[PDB]
């Protein structure tokens, strides 16, 4: 039972010399809870952030395999963030703690600087998602 058919719609464009991160919704989620569902949240951070102020996070929606957030974040790090990547950590919250790895992905600021990234990203592993950046057009 490892059907990683879940997809996430993540958008990251450069505007006002800042990063416009917009998370739409997710579809085809797989149950990672005893109740037979999954309630993950959207987490994004632009390393290196030792100030802990570039770390953005939203709360989970509810019991559904197709949750929509529609959250829009806009921030940017120092000029030396071009070689850095926007790390998105998608985890399934379990009320008291976390213990379900849904998937992780990242977007390079250097690539995003010359072209905005918007599409459906597949469920990749920690290293797979932080070292790569392959979005699916789906349109």
């Amino acid at each position: 039972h490892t059907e990683k058919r879940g997809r996430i719609y993540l958008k990251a464009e450069v505007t006002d010399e800042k990063l416009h991160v917009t998370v739409r919704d997710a579809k085809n989620l797989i149950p990672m809870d005893p109740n037979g569902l999954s309630d993950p949240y959207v987490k994004l951070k632009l390393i290196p952030d030792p100030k802990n102020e570039s770390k953005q996070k939203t709360k989970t929606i509810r019991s559904t395999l197709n949750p929509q957030w529609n959250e829009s974040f806009t921030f940017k790090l120092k000029p030396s963030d071009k070689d850095r990547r926007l790390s998105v950590e998608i985890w399934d919250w379990d009320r008291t703690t976390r213990n379900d790895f849904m998937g992780s992905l990242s977007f390079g600021v250097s690539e995003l600087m010359k072209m905005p990234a918007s599409g459906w990203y597949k469920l990749l592993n920690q290293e797979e998602g932080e070292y790569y950046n392959v979005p699916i057009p789906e349109g």
Binding site: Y41, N52, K55, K57, K59, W91, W93, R95, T96, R98
Partner: peptide, 10 residues
């Protein structure tokens, strides 16, 4: 860095 990963609901 604090407990942000496990900081949502009680």
């Amino acid at each position: 860095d604090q407990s942000d990963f496990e900081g949502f609901s009680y």
